[PDB]
Structures are given as structure tokens and as C-alpha cells.
Design an enzyme around this catalytic site. Structure first.
Site, PDB file in Angstrom:
ATOM      1  N   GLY A 244       0.755  -1.235   0.000  1.00 20.58           N
ATOM      2  CA  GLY A 244       0.000   0.000   0.000  1.00 20.58           C
ATOM      3  C   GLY A 244       0.791   1.294   0.000  1.00 20.58           C
TER       4      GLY A 244
ATOM      5  N   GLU B 131       4.947  -6.253   1.410  1.00 18.08           N
ATOM      6  CA  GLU B 131       4.471  -6.737   0.118  1.00 18.08           C
ATOM      7  C   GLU B 131       4.144  -5.561  -0.808  1.00 18.08           C
ATOM      8  OE1 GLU B 131       0.954  -8.917   1.444  1.00 18.08           O
ATOM      9  OE2 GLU B 131       2.107 -10.774   1.688  1.00 18.08           O
ATOM     10  N   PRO B 132       5.070  -4.622  -0.980  1.00 21.52           N
ATOM     11  CA  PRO B 132       4.795  -3.506  -1.894  1.00 21.52           C
ATOM     12  C   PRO B 132       4.587  -3.962  -3.331  1.00 21.52           C
ATOM     13  CG  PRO B 132       7.137  -3.646  -1.489  1.00 21.52           C
ATOM     14  CD  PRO B 132       6.485  -4.704  -0.623  1.00 21.52           C
ATOM     15  N   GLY B 133       3.589  -3.362  -3.967  1.00 21.70           N
ATOM     16  CA  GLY B 133       3.361  -3.629  -5.372  1.00 21.70           C
ATOM     17  C   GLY B 133       3.516  -2.383  -6.246  1.00 21.70           C
ATOM     18  N   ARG B 134       2.529  -1.508  -6.141  1.00 19.17           N
ATOM     19  CA  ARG B 134       2.489  -0.245  -6.889  1.00 19.17           C
ATOM     20  C   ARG B 134       3.791   0.555  -6.783  1.00 19.17           C
ATOM     21  NH1 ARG B 134      -1.631   2.447  -9.008  1.00 19.17           N
ATOM     22  NH2 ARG B 134      -3.292   1.270  -7.953  1.00 19.17           N
TER      23      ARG B 134
ATOM     24  N   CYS C  61     -15.550   1.501 -29.559  1.00 17.48           N
ATOM     25  CA  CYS C  61     -16.951   1.853 -29.820  1.00 17.48           C
ATOM     26  C   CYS C  61     -17.563   2.667 -28.702  1.00 17.48           C
ATOM     27  CB  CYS C  61     -17.800   0.594 -29.960  1.00 17.48           C
ATOM     28  SG  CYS C  61     -17.765  -0.556 -28.535  1.00 17.48           S
TER      29      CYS C  61
ATOM     30  N   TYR D  51      -0.425  -2.130 -12.522  1.00 16.24           N
ATOM     31  CA  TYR D  51      -1.766  -2.631 -12.781  1.00 16.24           C
ATOM     32  C   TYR D  51      -2.268  -2.239 -14.171  1.00 16.24           C
ATOM     33  CZ  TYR D  51      -1.685  -3.535  -7.721  1.00 16.24           C
ATOM     34  OH  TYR D  51      -1.360  -4.011  -6.459  1.00 16.24           O
TER      35      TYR D  51
HETATM   36  C1  LIG Z   1     -21.969   2.272 -34.191  1.00 17.09           C
HETATM   37  C2  LIG Z   1     -22.531   1.210 -33.308  1.00 17.09           C
HETATM   38  N1  LIG Z   1     -23.478   0.362 -33.821  1.00 17.09           N
HETATM   39  C3  LIG Z   1     -24.074  -0.583 -33.091  1.00 17.09           C
HETATM   40  C4  LIG Z   1     -23.730  -0.769 -31.743  1.00 17.09           C
HETATM   41  C5  LIG Z   1     -24.415  -1.864 -30.980  1.00 17.09           C
HETATM   42  O1  LIG Z   1     -25.109  -1.368 -29.831  1.00 17.09           O
HETATM   43  P1  LIG Z   1     -26.017  -2.389 -28.988  1.00 17.09           P
HETATM   44  O2  LIG Z   1     -25.142  -3.553 -28.606  1.00 17.09           O
HETATM   45  O3  LIG Z   1     -27.158  -2.790 -29.921  1.00 17.09           O
HETATM   46  O4  LIG Z   1     -26.455  -1.606 -27.753  1.00 17.09           O
HETATM   47  C6  LIG Z   1     -22.750   0.095 -31.170  1.00 17.09           C
HETATM   48  C7  LIG Z   1     -22.372  -0.015 -29.762  1.00 17.09           C
HETATM   49  N2  LIG Z   1     -21.452   0.708 -29.221  1.00 17.09           N
HETATM   50  C8  LIG Z   1     -21.247   0.929 -27.787  1.00 17.09           C
HETATM   51  C9  LIG Z   1     -21.485  -0.346 -26.966  1.00 17.09           C
HETATM   52  C10 LIG Z   1     -20.821  -0.202 -25.616  1.00 17.09           C
HETATM   53  C11 LIG Z   1     -20.964  -1.419 -24.724  1.00 17.09           C
HETATM   54  N3  LIG Z   1     -20.160  -1.208 -23.533  1.00 17.09           N
HETATM   55  C12 LIG Z   1     -20.101  -2.038 -22.497  1.00 17.09           C
HETATM   56  N4  LIG Z   1     -19.331  -1.754 -21.464  1.00 17.09           N
HETATM   57  N5  LIG Z   1     -20.818  -3.147 -22.486  1.00 17.09           N
HETATM   58  C13 LIG Z   1     -22.076   2.127 -27.261  1.00 17.09           C
HETATM   59  O5  LIG Z   1     -23.201   2.357 -27.784  1.00 17.09           O
HETATM   60  O6  LIG Z   1     -21.545   2.832 -26.356  1.00 17.09           O
HETATM   61  C14 LIG Z   1     -22.106   1.053 -32.009  1.00 17.09           C
HETATM   62  O7  LIG Z   1     -21.110   1.770 -31.587  1.00 17.09           O
HETATM   63  C1  LIG Z   2      -2.446  -8.970   0.232  1.00 16.95           C
HETATM   64  C2  LIG Z   2      -1.864  -7.912  -0.661  1.00 16.95           C
HETATM   65  N1  LIG Z   2      -0.533  -7.553  -0.535  1.00 16.95           N
HETATM   66  C3  LIG Z   2       0.051  -6.583  -1.238  1.00 16.95           C
HETATM   67  C4  LIG Z   2      -0.709  -5.861  -2.165  1.00 16.95           C
HETATM   68  C5  LIG Z   2      -0.042  -4.787  -2.976  1.00 16.95           C
HETATM   69  O1  LIG Z   2      -0.671  -3.516  -2.778  1.00 16.95           O
HETATM   70  P1  LIG Z   2       0.067  -2.228  -3.419  1.00 16.95           P
HETATM   71  O2  LIG Z   2       0.194  -2.537  -4.895  1.00 16.95           O
HETATM   72  O3  LIG Z   2       1.399  -1.982  -2.739  1.00 16.95           O
HETATM   73  O4  LIG Z   2      -0.913  -1.102  -3.115  1.00 16.95           O
HETATM   74  C6  LIG Z   2      -2.074  -6.205  -2.346  1.00 16.95           C
HETATM   75  C7  LIG Z   2      -2.901  -5.424  -3.309  1.00 16.95           C
HETATM   76  N2  LIG Z   2      -4.108  -5.748  -3.591  1.00 16.95           N
HETATM   77  C8  LIG Z   2      -5.144  -4.895  -4.169  1.00 16.95           C
HETATM   78  C9  LIG Z   2      -4.601  -4.030  -5.313  1.00 16.95           C
HETATM   79  C10 LIG Z   2      -5.774  -3.576  -6.161  1.00 16.95           C
HETATM   80  C11 LIG Z   2      -5.342  -2.833  -7.394  1.00 16.95           C
HETATM   81  N3  LIG Z   2      -6.491  -2.671  -8.258  1.00 16.95           N
HETATM   82  C12 LIG Z   2      -6.464  -1.952  -9.374  1.00 16.95           C
HETATM   83  N4  LIG Z   2      -7.544  -1.855 -10.115  1.00 16.95           N
HETATM   84  N5  LIG Z   2      -5.374  -1.292  -9.708  1.00 16.95           N
HETATM   85  C13 LIG Z   2      -5.891  -4.057  -3.098  1.00 16.95           C
HETATM   86  O5  LIG Z   2      -5.243  -3.610  -2.117  1.00 16.95           O
HETATM   87  O6  LIG Z   2      -7.127  -3.858  -3.295  1.00 16.95           O
HETATM   88  C14 LIG Z   2      -2.637  -7.281  -1.624  1.00 16.95           C
HETATM   89  O7  LIG Z   2      -3.820  -7.700  -1.829  1.00 16.95           O
END
Ligand SMILES: Cc1ncc(COP(=O)(O)O)c(/C=N/[C@H](CCCNC(=N)N)C(=O)O)c1O
Ligand SMILES: Cc1ncc(COP(=O)(O)O)c(/C=N/[C@H](CCCNC(=N)N)C(=O)O)c1O
Ligand code: NA
Ligand code: NA
EC number: 4.1.1.116
Lengths: 458, 452
Positions: B245, B293-296, B373, B408
Site C-alpha cells: 500500500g 508486500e509492496p506492489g504499486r 466503440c 496494474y
Molecule cells: C456504431 C454502433 N453500432 C451498433 C452498436 C451496438 O449497440 P447495442 O449492442 O445494440 O447496444 C454500437 C455499440 N457501441 C457501444 C457499446 C458499448 C458497450 N459497452 C459495455 N461496457 N458493455 C455504445 O453504444 O456505447 C455502435 O457503436
Molecule cells: C495482500 C496484498 N498484498 C500486497 C498488495 C499490494 O498492494 P500495493 O500494490 O502496494 O498497493 C495487495 C494489493 N491488492 C489490491 C490491489 C488492487 C489494485 N487494483 C487496481 N484496479 N489497480 C488491493 O489492495 O485492493 C494485496 O492484496
């Protein structure tokens, strides 16, 4: 709360009684006759199972919805799911394909869609992308910017091959919040310039409203904008458009008890049907032309309801909060499944609700409040879109080794997986028209995962 | 606004004049003497470039912070980045490794970490995972539940091989850990298991923690209970494992930041982390081993995402009805949230500069979009609201850099829209570059599928 639990078990019984996809056998959830507990004993969890019969039913819904307009073309938005076996099933069902990258175009061509059955969308189409698309004679390239248009002119000239295009317009804060499309004000000059280009052929205008849109009015408003400008440009430029491309956005029901939901406050309730989408779109186009071709680009609706995520309950614990004098404040029953947000991205990152049930105990009352966690490090890797707050309902007797099912898990769930914590991306199983199962995507192996790296083994 | 722009360009000049990582040459951002505009002409964008020298600098900061306690063992949290060449750099820098899955354990072993240099954490450790760990003589398996502990007992007995464990406790000053109230009986039972050796207690406070008080209080809880259990059970613990952390600065102008509301300001340093931990441990024992256990902190500052400006457009809102009200200049890069996940899903700020024009004033307000998209695939964590600053001279083909992109950012990529996951380049200790991860190929993507 007791009411919330009562309602949830009414929904549970509807799944196994009046749902065209599901049954039960021996108290196990079944999908197109396939026992999902038993399937999850044959393939290692977590994995997704897709139903070809349900994809076919969804496509029929869409196609039937557009019966008032014979000249309709339907392009599956392959960004929704481009596992090759799923694309092959959609091709066999008889619709076309939409693609958002060079590799998407290529996979659609590989699996058997002809160039004239493929539409290429995107805000970034590099020259190599455009050259590939133009050389394969795609049905449409949907131009998103004047910069891209310059490349299409130059590359179509290099290849001496006609590029067939739509101009994407933003029908609508949308200068600050909508990256895609041209401003409406730019359509006229853009179209004028295309007409003069020797190898660029203007077919029509394009728009896409959004995803999981739970009302018809936005589709009607936006389509009218596109139709009014199409009509106006026909008169001003002295042309007849081949088509209009109205995009995607047909919602899918992720919560089914519509009597208790407001689609405008919670778009997990679908709000409208494919028929309502068609009625809105066709009505606006017919105020201009009844003969013009309407292109649609549904994604979500084709596959969303047609897969289930199966994940094994892999650990359990009770965590207890005490006051400062050792007296219990509350207990939390945690169940841990072997899928977290690296497997089901939108549950975490886009606050998406999926029905959760114990597929091994589908006929048992889901009567204990539990919290459902994934296997990742992240303290935030648990499923927060609960039945009530962040709490889910499972049978009190739920046991490590039971199979949990997430329903409605077929849209935007496979390519959005990661290998976070070096957990592999999942296998994918398909049920065909005869009810038989087969693996259509392997789970990532240990080898697959290190193979991208360049290193000397110790 | 004029002051936000001046301040951002003050930060920009400090990158190229007063940052141990970076220089400028020919108008271009350089990383450890490597011209990043030139590098991005050799490899296809988007890709990440890592600095082994910076990883080494970060590890030195961590290890120097703990100089007051000789017996400290440092495990890199490999969840942060497990590209094999990054793990190799960390191994060659002299520290140990922490793993959160069977395949992470395996890759740590395959790159050369010994069993006694590996800690295995996780809320889900299936029997197959546990068997692999025990068979490979891991330094620690950090027990997260009583259910897991029963498997460890059974499997260690079957293998007739000792499993070394910590008991993870959650100090309630959350899905992981046991309740503190459960530590005594759990430790009592582990002592009685024939093939389980109890090493100590474990905790992990969180990620990017911008203050020392959480670590001091959590450490004191574990020290107090460790001290008590030594008395009650008649034992001397090998160690105490205080987790990770240590934060990394993602915004550097600390004068203008409140770390307790915006944790992109780091708030504390490794030295503040160590001071808090050591102060508490030394109320009990100076000889005991402290595991961290440093990561980041190990890799966060040690990578840059390079992405080519690939499109541009102007969108104009005409009065909401008619008359020019405002222009918005959109710049599209070839990396979106499938490449840099935390920018989207966790509201993470990364400094953005035009690496091709790093010595030019960043004097133009733009919005920065990716290629996906999704209408939401644009970068919303801007310099001012959702707006960024780039030189007005920015052109398609310029290389944009995201700094501090080393934690990450690789394993969290996707192939959404069938855009490939990125290549990764390493700058080694001699300043030379090499590819350490290929970009996914078309063939890669379809090979997982089973089809005709
Ligand atoms: C030009 C174009 N034609 C069709 C579709 C099909 O849309 P539908 O699956 O029917 O809702 C999209 C879809 N684009 C993106 C999805 C994003 C989905 N994101 C997600 N996290 N699940 C949008 O509309 O933002 C598009 O960009
Ligand atoms: C037992 C344990 N030991 C060490 C670390 C190293 O942490 P540090 O990278 O130094 O902040 C973690 C980290 N786990 C997760 C990261 C989550 C990162 N998620 C992301 N989307 N980037 C947490 O603390 O939630 C852990 O679970
Ligand atoms: Na033309
Ligand atoms: Na023992």
C-alpha cells in the site's frame, strides 16, 4: 425485505416454469434441456455457455419487428461477442455483420460473411485499416471525421476501388460528451465532397443512439433528425440515397419484473421491445421514403439473453463486526465464486445487474442474504449489484461446490475479460440447435499466458 | 484556468529539467536517455515502455526506508505487473515475490524466484492451488479462511510436506482475512497440525494509502496480538507481515493537493510507511522479521504508455440551437480503456504530455478519446475537468505519453473490439531497449476459439 425475498423467489420460479430458455431437472437449472450443474462438472469453472436456439429466437424477434419495411438489412454488432462459433451461428441465422476494427473485419470475412455483408464503424480507422476494408469491398465504411475521409479518398484512389460510405452524424453537451460522428451542420459539405471523389460512393447517413436505451422516443427523435437531413440533402445535391443506417441500441431485459421497475430510473428494465424500436424507426423513415433501405446494427439484443455464466462456489466465510466490548454487531455470510470482475467486467465497471441463482439448488427457496465475492486481490472484487443493496439471495443450504449461474450474460462478456492475477480468461461452451454441447473457446492455459512474453527461462 | 495552464506547464518543464527519469532531446521526451518519439517509430503503438533503472530506484527507496530494522524481507506484489522481463528485473534487483494465483506462483518460480522467496495470498485457494504451493516449499501461504485452512491441513498431511503459513487478520480500526477474534484459536490449532508451521500474522491495509495513521494503527493491532499470542501459546513468531500500500505520486504539485480527498497525491513516502511500521514493531521485538508486500511503489513510476495521435476532429455546439457557442477539439489516440483500464474504471489520473513536442507549451485545451466503440471510451481524468492540455501544434502522428503507467496496467488489458493487447518494451540498466511482450497478433486472438 421479506417482500423483496418473496418477489425474488417468484422470479426464480418463473425461470424454471415460463421461460423459453430454461427448465429444471433433479433440482438443477437446465438451459435448452442441458443440465447446467452437470455441464459444470464436465468443464472447469468459470465458463460461459451460449444457446444457439436463443440467438435464433432473438434474431427472429428483430427480423419480425421490421416486417412493415421489406428493404431492411440487419448487421450484428460483433463487438458484442465475436467468438467464432457465435459468429458462425449468427451467419447461419441469416443476418450480416458489423465490425469496429481491422481484426473484427478479418474475422467476419474468415467465418464466411461476404464483404457486402460487412459494415465497418469506428472513430479511429488508420490507413492500414481503411486499405484492408476498401480492398475487401465492404458494404459500408461509416465515416466518422473529415480527417478519415481524406484517407479514404487517397486510398480508394490508390486501389482504384470504390469505397462505399455512410456519413455518421451526431443527431443531438454532445460536443463535449460525444466523440463520434460529424456535427449535423457538417453533413452537407461532407456529402458534397464525397460526390466529387472518383472512388468514394455516398450511400446514406448513419447514426447510433446508444446502448440499452429503455425508451422509444430517443430513437424516434434521432431518426427524424437523420431522415430530415437525408431528405434535404437529396433535394440540395440532386441525389437519391440508397439507404439510412440507424445503428443499434435495442435493450435487453436484465430485470424482468416490469411492474416493480421504472425503465427511466433503472435501465436494467428494458422499457421497450424490438417491435417498439422498429415502429419508431420505420415510422420516421416512411415520412421520407418507403422504398429506401434501412440498415440496423443490433448487438446486445442478438446475444445478451443467450448465455449463462457458470461459476463454482469455491470458499465461504462468516465475518463478524463487534463493538468495542466484544458484543456482536452483525454477521456477513460471504460466498466466494471462482469468477470476479476479470471474468464478468460490466458487473463491476458498469454497475450491471444480472440475475444470480444457485443452479445446483434452483428449486430451493433463495432465502439467505449473502455477499458474493470474486477471487481477485482487489478489495473491490465482489459483486455489488445485489438483490437488495450489495446483498444477494441464495439458499441457506448453499455449499462449497455448488454452481452459481449469472443469467443474461451473452453481451459484452467475452472480449472484455482480463488475465488479472494471472487467472485465465474463460472457456466458452455452445448448445447447438439439437441441444448438444461443445467447447468453442478454450480456457487460457498457463502456456498461452506466458507465450506473449520474451524472456530466458531460469 | 490561465493559472491551471501555467501550473501544468511548470510541471511539464520539471519533467524534462528536474526528474530523475526523464530528459528532452530534439524536442522529444526521453526516458533514461531513450528518445520516446523515436522509440515509437520502431514499435507499433500503443505500447508500454518500462525502465529497469527506475524499478531499481524505487526498490532502493523501499529498502533504505527500512534501514532501522535489519531483518526486513520485501516481496514484490506480482499482481501489479508480471510480464516475465519485469519480474526478472525485480528478481535481479534482489527482492522477493508475492503471488495471488497458482499461475502467478508458477511464473515466479519459472523466472527464478525460489520457493523460499514466494508468498501466496488470496481469498480463493483451491485444493489444486494449495497442493502446488505446498509441493513447491513456498515461504508463506497467507491463510484467509478457516475453510482454506482445513484443506491446507489435509493436503500437507497427504504430501507429508510442511506448509508454512501466516494467518491473515483484518484489523477493524471487506472480504479478506479472519476476524481478530479468531486469531488465537486458529493459531492454537495450527500449532497442533503436524505439517503446518505457523510463521506469524498478516495484514494488508489497502492500495494507494495517502497517510501513515492507517498503517501505524493496523501494525499496532497486529503487534499487540502477536505479543499476546507469544505469551499465551509459548512461542516466538518468525515474522510479522504488514502487507503493501505504499502510495505513488500521480500528481506531483503537492502544495495544491489534499491527499485525504484525492489520493492521486501520495501524501506519504516509503520512509513514512517504514517509520510507522518500525515504531510499532520495535515496542515488541527488534529481532523479528518484518515482511512487506509492496506492489504499486515498485513499478508504478517506472513505465510510460506511448500512444499515437491517430485522428482529430472539431465539434461545435451552435448555441444549443443556432450561433457558435463553443468549439471542442477532440484528439483520438490509439489506446483506450482496453489498454489503460484504471483511467476509466477507477478514475485514475496519469500525467499526459505530447512526447513529440515535449518542449512546446501545452497551450490548447482538448478532449482525449480512445478508439473503442464505447461512447464512454474517452479519458475523463483531465487537467481541468475532462479537458487536457496539448500543444496547439499537435498533429496526427504525434506520440502522446501517459506517465506513471507501470502499476496494474498490463494484465488488466482486454481485446475489446478485437484491438490487440499491447507490446511492452524494457529499457535495461545499460539504457538499451528490447521487446519483452509482443502485441497480440490476429492469429493470437482467434487461436483460442475452436472453429472451422
Ligand atoms: C456504431 C454502433 N453500432 C451498433 C452498436 C451496438 O449497440 P447495442 O449492442 O445494440 O447496444 C454500437 C455499440 N457501441 C457501444 C457499446 C458499448 C458497450 N459497452 C459495455 N461496457 N458493455 C455504445 O453504444 O456505447 C455502435 O457503436
Ligand atoms: C495482500 C496484498 N498484498 C500486497 C498488495 C499490494 O498492494 P500495493 O500494490 O502496494 O498497493 C495487495 C494489493 N491488492 C489490491 C490491489 C488492487 C489494485 N487494483 C487496481 N484496479 N489497480 C488491493 O489492495 O485492493 C494485496 O492484496
Ligand atoms: Na463520389
Ligand atoms: Na504445526
Amino acid at each position: 425485505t421479506d417482500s423483496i425475498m418473496q418477489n425474488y423467489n417468484q422470479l426464480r420460479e418463473q425461470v424454471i416454469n415460463g421461460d423459453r430458455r430454461f427448465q429444471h431437472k433433479d433440482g438443477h437449472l437446465c438451459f435448452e434441456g442441458v443440465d447446467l450443474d452437470a455441464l459444470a462438472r464436465q468443464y472447469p469453472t468459470p465458463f460461459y455457455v451460449f444457446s444457439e436456439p436463443e440467438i435464433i429466437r432473438n434474431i427472429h424477434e428483430i427480423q419480425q419487428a421490421f416486417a412493415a419495411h421489406k428493404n431492411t438489412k440487419t448487421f450484428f454488432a460483433s463487438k458484442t461477442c465475436s467468438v467464432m462459433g457465435v459468429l458462425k451461428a449468427i451467419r447461419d441465422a441469416g443476418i450480416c455483420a458489423e465490425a469496429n476494427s481491422q481484426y473484427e473485419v478479418r474475422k467476419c470475412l474468415e467465418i464466411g460473411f461476404r464483404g457486402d455483408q460487412i459494415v465497418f464503424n469506428g472513430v479511429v480507422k488508420k490507413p492500414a485499416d481503411l486499405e484492408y476494408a476498401i480492398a475487401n469491398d465492404l458494404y459500408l465504411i461509416n465515416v466518422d471525421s473529415l480527417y478519415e475521409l481524406e484517407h479514404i479518398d487517397a486510398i480508394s484512389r490508390k486501389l482504384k476501388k470504390v469505397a462505399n460510405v455512410c456519413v455518421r452524424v451526431e443527431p443531438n453537451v454532445t460536443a463535449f460528451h460525444a466523440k463520434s460522428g460529424l456535427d449535423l451542420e457538417q453533413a452537407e459539405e461532407t456529402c458534397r465532397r464525397i460526390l466529387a471523389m472518383p472512388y468514394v460512393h455516398l450511400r446514406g447517413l448513419h447514426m447510433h443512439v446508444g446502448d440499452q436505451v429503455p425508451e422509444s422516443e430517443p430513437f424516434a427523435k434521432a431518426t427524424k433528425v437523420l431522415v430530415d437531413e437525408s431528405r434535404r440533402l437529396e433535394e440540395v445535391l440532386g441525389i437519391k440515397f440508397d439507404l439510412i443506417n440507424v445503428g443499434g441500441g435495442i435493450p435487453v431485459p436484465y430485470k424482468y419484473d416490469d411492474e416493480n421497475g421504472d425503465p427511466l430510473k433503472d435501465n436494467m428494465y428494458a422499457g421497450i421491445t424490438a417491435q417498439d424500436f422498429a415502429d419508431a424507426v420505420i415510422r420516421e423513415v416512411h415520412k421520407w421514403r418507403t422504398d429506401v433501405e434501412i440498415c440496423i446494427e443490433p448487438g446486445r439484443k442478438v446475444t445478451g439473453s443467450a448465455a449463462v455464466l457458470l461459476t463454482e462456489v469455491s470458499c465461504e466465510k462468516r465475518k463478524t463486526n463487534y463493538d468495542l466490548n466484544g458484543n456482536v454487531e452483525c454477521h456477513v455470510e460471504w460466498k466466494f465464486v471462482d469468477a470476479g470482475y476479470s471474468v464478468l467486467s460490466d458487473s463491476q465497471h458498469f454497475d450491471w445487474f444480472f440475475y444470480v441463482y444457485n443452479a445446483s439448488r434452483m428449486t430451493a427457496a433463495h432465502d439467505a442474504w449473502i455477499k458474493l465475492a470474486g477471487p481477485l486481490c482487489d478489495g473491490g472484487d465482489y459483486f455489488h449489484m445485489g438483490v437488495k443493496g450489495e446483498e444477494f439471495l441464495l439458499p441457506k443450504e448453499t455449499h462449497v461446490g455448488d454452481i452459481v449461474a449469472f443469467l443474461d450474460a451473452g453481451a459484452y462478456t467475452i472480449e472484455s475479460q482480463t488475465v488479472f492475477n494471472n487467472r485465465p480468461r474463460t472457456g466458452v461452451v455452445m448448445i447447438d440447435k439439437n441441444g448438444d454441447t461443445r467447447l468453442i473457446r478454450r480456457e487460457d492455459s498457463y502456456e498461452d499466458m506466458v507465450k506473449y512474453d520474451i524472456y530466458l527461462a531460469a
